[PDB]
Structure formats: structure tokens, C-alpha cells
Amino acid sequence: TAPRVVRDRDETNFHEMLGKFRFDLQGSFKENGDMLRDSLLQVGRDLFLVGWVKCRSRFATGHIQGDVHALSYMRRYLEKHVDESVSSVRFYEENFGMPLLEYERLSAVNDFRAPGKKQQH
């Protein structure tokens, strides 16, 4: 687990680093956010996403991790290239350069609560 202090430069290692994404969406969505979740999953597979994501009617956040260069494209896609209406984009934290990764597969957390408890809640 050698840090970037060993010899990363602009020759060949400039595109050999990992990190975490930074995004926090907020605003109303069509139906219950089904369109946004489906669109994000298809694009995420092409970029070989590892982290997870959360989608809902209003709340939309998550933690996405991957390559330093791969995540750069997603920043522009999820800021202007949005078919739905977006109010504003927030940020929580970011970090570039880290040995190995935490997650292994891309998945979206969905509300699988039973319908019986929905009325009580």
C-alpha cells in the first residue's frame, strides 16, 4: 500500500490513481425517481462503478468510488446532462488517491419495506 509519495508524475502514472466521487442531488423527480435510478445504473456499468447510490422521490445521494479519471466524466453528466429538473448540487467530501477499494459491485439501495407497515408509519 505505497502512498503517492513514490514517484507519481505526469509521464505515465497520472491516470493510475483511485478516489471517491462527490455529489449530492436534491429536488423533485418524476413518479418516484424510477427514471433517474434506471438511467444512472446503465451509465454506471460502462464506467465500471464500484460504490453504491441512493435514489428517492426527493432525496438522492450516495458514495461512489473508482478511478480518478473515470469519475471526472460523471461530474459533468450529473450536473448539466440531466433530463429532469434539478434545483442545486451539493457536496460532502472527496479524496483522491487510496490503495485498493472498499465495495466490489454496484448496487442501488431500494425501499423494500413491507406494505403493511407503510400505513402505520
Binding site: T12, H15, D46, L47, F48, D67, H69, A70
Partner: protein, 152 residues
């Protein structure tokens, strides 16, 4: 890297002057030969006539192209089709050091298709043997050879 035949620099030197540089020489030679050694008409019609001056001219072109086939160093398959030699030459160079991400590796196939240079040689290849051979047997003739070299 004690020896001078295994460093990163020498590998690149032989990967351009022998892979891409040699491929272009064969490509131009094949096209140039066809201009100076034309045929009576269509390639398909020339086999059904069994006429002289067509079997002879075609045979000469086959030997000239074979003698003018450079031997690739990095590639050991030794392909005979000029279209395939150029298509595969770029794949080896692109996979050496061209890409910068996982996605770029998967998009290598699309890069070759977008290039207009490779699209010109797609419609120029050898006729498969199983084109006229079945038809010849139908009429029941035992005096025709599909191969041009053997026919002469």
C-alpha cells in the same frame, strides 16, 4: 534490464518500423500490381471461361504478392490478407501504451471501424473456395481447377 534488448525504448523502435511501416509497403504493392496487371473482366467470369491469358496473369500476381510479404516480428501469425495485417497492427500498438482507463480498452474495436483507411480494403479480398466449386460439380466436368497456381 541489464541487456539492451529488453528495455522499453528498443521495444517501441521495432514496433513501428516492422509492424506499421512494413504493413503499408505491402498494401501499396498489392494495389499497384492490380493496376499494371488487369484482367479481361470480373473475377467471377474469368473462372467460368477457362481462357488463356487470364489463368497465366493471375498466377503471376500470386507469386509476386507472396514474395512481397514482409515478416512481422511482433506478430507471428503471418497473415496473408493485407486488410487483416493493417487492422491487427494498430490493435497491438494501441494496447501497448495508448489507453488511460478501463473504458478505453473496451472501445478499441470502434476506433478501427471509425478509421476510413481500413474501410477501403474491406471490399477487396480473396473469393472463398465454396463459391464456384459446387457449381462446377453440378454440370459434371473433371477438367477445371479452382486454384490459379495449379491450373497453370
Amino acid at each position: 534490464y541489464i541487456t539492451s534488448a529488453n528495455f522499453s525504448e528498443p521495444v517501441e523502435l521495432l514496433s513501428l518500423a516492422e509492424d506499421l511501416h512494413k504493413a503499408e509497403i505491402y498494401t501499396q504493392t498489392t494495389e499497384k500490381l492490380e493496376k499494371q496487371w488487369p484482367a479481361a473482366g470480373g473475377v467471377a467470369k474469368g473462372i467460368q471461361g477457362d481462357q488463356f491469358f487470364d489463368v497465366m496473369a493471375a498466377a503471376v500476381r500470386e507469386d509476386l504478392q507472396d514474395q512481397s510479404r514482409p515478416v512481422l516480428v511482433n506478430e507471428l501469425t503471418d497473415h496473408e490478407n493485407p486488410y487483416c495485417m493493417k487492422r491487427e497492427a494498430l490493435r497491438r500498438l494501441v494496447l501497448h501504451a495508448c489507453t488511460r482507463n478501463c473504458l478505453d480498452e473496451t472501445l478499441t474495436d470502434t476506433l478501427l471501424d471509425r478509421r476510413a483507411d481500413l474501410q477501403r480494403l474491406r471490399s477487396k479480398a480473396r473469393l472463398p473456395p465454396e463459391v464456384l466449386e459446387p457449381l462446377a460439380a453440378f454440370v459434371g466436368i473433371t477438367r477445371f481447377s479452382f486454384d490459379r497456381r495449379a491450373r497453370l
